[PDB]
Design an enzyme around this catalytic site. Structure first.
Site, PDB file in Angstrom:
ATOM      1  N   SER A 107      -1.604   6.718  -0.976  1.00 38.93           N
ATOM      2  CA  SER A 107      -0.621   6.850  -2.046  1.00 38.93           C
ATOM      3  C   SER A 107      -1.231   7.024  -3.443  1.00 38.93           C
ATOM      4  O   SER A 107      -0.466   7.093  -4.410  1.00 38.93           O
ATOM      5  CB  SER A 107       0.428   5.749  -2.023  1.00 38.93           C
ATOM      6  OG  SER A 107      -0.097   4.541  -2.484  1.00 38.93           O
ATOM      7  N   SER A 153      -3.972   2.958   0.461  1.00 37.66           N
ATOM      8  CA  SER A 153      -4.563   2.400   1.668  1.00 37.66           C
ATOM      9  C   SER A 153      -3.979   3.124   2.868  1.00 37.66           C
ATOM     10  O   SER A 153      -2.871   3.664   2.809  1.00 37.66           O
ATOM     11  CB  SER A 153      -4.320   0.894   1.777  1.00 37.66           C
ATOM     12  OG  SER A 153      -2.961   0.595   2.017  1.00 37.66           O
ATOM     13  N   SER A 186       3.688   0.927  -4.559  1.00 41.13           N
ATOM     14  CA  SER A 186       3.355   1.770  -3.408  1.00 41.13           C
ATOM     15  C   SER A 186       4.539   1.903  -2.458  1.00 41.13           C
ATOM     16  O   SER A 186       4.376   1.987  -1.242  1.00 41.13           O
ATOM     17  CB  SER A 186       2.110   1.295  -2.666  1.00 41.13           C
ATOM     18  OG  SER A 186       1.013   1.273  -3.554  1.00 41.13           O
TER      19      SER A 186
END
Ligand SMILES: [Cl-]
Length: 259
Positions: free
Chosen positions: A43, A210, A103
């Site tokens: 992201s 991640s 995120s």
């Protein structure tokens, strides 16, 4: 050479593949480590998607107030903000903030969709002069991070140069640039990443990422105390599909290149 040896040692101890690009605007210098290799963005690509919406808003003054329905069918794998708004609407401003600061996967997907999809986000990058960035997929599949797969990747050099343009340069109008910086400074996901490798007094705006293969990323604009700003990209990925996160590696890289 010392910085290069320290980054190589960190990479070896970590077991993975580390990519670093620091731009120091004090002297227009760079510190680079695997800076032309490709890494899965996860992201961290939300900065480009939000910037595309901000650019669009320069000719559509009320775009950020536009309402977007949130439905159960929008939910993806990690929806910390959007899950609170199911069956109502969120504004594009709220979705931008949620994507950048939490995120939030739904928020990212709404930014992507608004501007026309991954190929449109990529075309915006090209318009800015970034010929390396590629956003291929939506959430959550953009996170697979398979070694050797160029989908949804960029290089540390390119992302640092583009982040400089977006946050310190002239890619966006003054109101829109300030809004991006404000959003990034309000991030909640980055305190263990680049920020953890810098003095407490420094000011940071950052976007983490991640994904699969223990991929652990952070891209930041940094205002050191009484110094010209820095741009820092730290990208990290690992050999094992189910490797665990390594935010500490990003903190260590940040400390090495700013010491
Ligand atoms: Cl400190």
């Amino acid at each position: 050479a010392d910085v290069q040896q320290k980054l190589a040692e960190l990479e070896r101890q970590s077991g993975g593949r580390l990519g670093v690009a620091l731009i120091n605007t004090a002297d227009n210098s760079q510190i680079l480590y695997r800076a032309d290799e490709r890494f899965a963005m996860c992201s961290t690509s939300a900065v480009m998607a939000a910037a595309a919406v901000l650019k669009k808003s320069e000719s559509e003054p009320n775009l950020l107030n536009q309402r977007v329905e949130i439905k159960k069918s929008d939910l993806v794998n990690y929806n910390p903000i959007a899950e609170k708004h199911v069956n109502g609407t969120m504004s594009l401003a709220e979705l931008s903030a949620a994507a950048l600061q939490y995120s939030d996967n739904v928020a990212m997907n709404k930014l992507i969709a608004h501007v026309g999809g991954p190929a449109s986000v990529t075309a915006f990058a090209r318009q800015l002069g970034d010929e390396t960035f590629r956003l291929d997929r939506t959430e959550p599949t953009l996170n697979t991070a398979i070694p050797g797969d160029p989908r949804d990747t960029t290089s540390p050099r390119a992302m640092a140069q583009t982040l400089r343009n977006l946050t310190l340069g002239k890619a966006l109008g003054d109101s829109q640039r300030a809004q991006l910086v404000t959003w990034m400074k309000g991030n909640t996901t980055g305190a263990a990443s680049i920020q953890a490798g810098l003095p407490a007094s420094w000011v940071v705006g950052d976007k983490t990422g991640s994904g699969g293969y223990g991929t652990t990323n952070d891209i930041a604009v940094i205002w050191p105390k009484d110094r010209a700003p820095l741009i820092l990209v730290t990208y990290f990925t690992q050999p094992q599909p189910k490797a665990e996160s390594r935010r500490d590696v990003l903190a260590s890289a940040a400390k090495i290149v700013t010491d």
